[PDB]
Structure 1
Amino acid sequence: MDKDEAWKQVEQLRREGATRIAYRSDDWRDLKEAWKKGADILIVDATDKDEAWKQVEQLRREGATEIAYRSDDWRDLKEAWKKGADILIVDATDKDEAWKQVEQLRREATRIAYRSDDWRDLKEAWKKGADILIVDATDKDEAWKQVEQLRREGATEIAYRSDDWRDLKEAWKKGADILIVDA
């Protein structure tokens, strides 16, 4: 998970013409650089550091307009929204309480991004209101099959995550619109 390699993936996807590139990191400085290089969606992870909202705060001040935040903890997600995140990432393995909070805000504002390794799960989340459906099957055959099926279902804002721009480009070709470089 090397930053210089990650930035190069963003650069290559930009050269290929992608306009909805995302970048996942725990460091606002790394995210700011990815932003300058072509990433429009900046995902603050810091699933290790608690007050990772400090990172959201700094990116907000720097002027990024699409900041995402991942936590399984609805209280953390809500704080991140308050500090300027507009995309809250919830996971299939999360407690039901996580979606419950992000759904309240989504009605009122925020977008919900749902990560599952089962495409039928992702479809249900789409039907239940999720704005962004993240495919991250490490098997590429299965992952690209999930992207294809979500496109067939009409699910919108399909995302795929990889450390390799070539896999992201294949996902893009098959129907993914958001391409997450995992730094």
Structure 2
Amino acid sequence: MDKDEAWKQVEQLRREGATRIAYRSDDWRDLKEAWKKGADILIVDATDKDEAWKQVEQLRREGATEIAYRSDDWRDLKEAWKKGADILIVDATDKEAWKQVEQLRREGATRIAYRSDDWRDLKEAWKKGADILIVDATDKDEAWKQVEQLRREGATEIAYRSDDWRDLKEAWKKGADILIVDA
């Protein structure tokens, strides 16, 4: 439900090469339209696995990249990966989540992401195999401080979710390279 202001801010930074835009939507056609407008990561999160995997398959047919899929269950992520998803988002917002990362690593996945509101959780996931660390802490004030800590720890691919362009901009300044906006 993001306003156009959120996309507007990430678009300006994306054009300057200062960020990648990740876009989440429940409709693959909306994801395709976003890809054509310059979105770099398309997040499928349909809870129905049949629909979600169908959305991954259709985005692959369209040539869209990079396709992401989000789940709390490594098995769903592994199926999405087989069907065309490149970025596998372990959702730790309701936790164990670290074990999902470990199993995906055992399966051979090398573009694992992890979504959490706590930098210490994200740091552990990073050590265990997650390469994209998603700070999603809209219920926590100044969550870009979590970005700052992960940046000092040496993580190279930090993403940040907010519906407010001001928060997105500050997270970029603190070291986020992927900004997540929503339909």
Instruction: Give TM-score, length-normalised by structure 2.
Output: 0.84
Note the alpha carbon deviations across 1:18-49, whole angstroms, 9 max, x for none. Answer: 44111011111111111111111111011356
Structure 1 pair 119–7 and aligned structure 2 pair: CA distance change class (3 A): closer
Cα distance change on mapping 1:111 and 1:149 into 2, 3 Å: same
Q: 1:140 to 1:166 in 2, by over 3 A?
A: farther
Give how far 1:101 is off. 5.3
Contact 2:26 2:45 in 1 (8 A): yes
How far the C-alpha of 1:167 sits from its partner, in A, is 2.1
Structure 1 pair 76/51, CA: closer, same or farther in 2 (3 Å)? farther
The structure-2 alpha-carbon separation of the partners of 1:107 and 1:58, relative to structure 1 and needing over 3 Å to count, comes to same
Q: Report the Cα offset of residue 68 of structure 1.
A: 0.5
Q: Taking structure 1 as the reference length, what is the TM-score of the superposition?
A: 0.84
Q: How many residues align?
A: 182
Unaligned runs of 5+ in 1: none
Q: Secondary structure at the match of 1:42?
A: strand
Instruction: Provide the C-alpha distance between the structure 2 equivalents of 1:75 and 1:51, rounded to a whole number of angstroms.
Output: 16
Matches of 2:153 and 2:98 in 1, distance apart? 22
Flag the 1:80–1:148 CA change in 2: closer, same or farther, 3 A.
Answer: same
Is the Cα–Cα contact under 8 Å of residues 11 and 37 in structure 1 kept in the other structure?
Answer: no
C-alpha deviation, 1:2, in angstroms: 5.4
CA-CA distance at 1:145 after TM superposition: 0.7
Counterpart contact for 1:117–1:135, Cα < 8 Å: yes
Residues 91 and 21 of structure 1: CA distance in aligned 2, closer, same or farther (over 3 Å): same
Structure 2 CA distance for aligned equivalents of residues 137 and 65 of structure 1 = 26
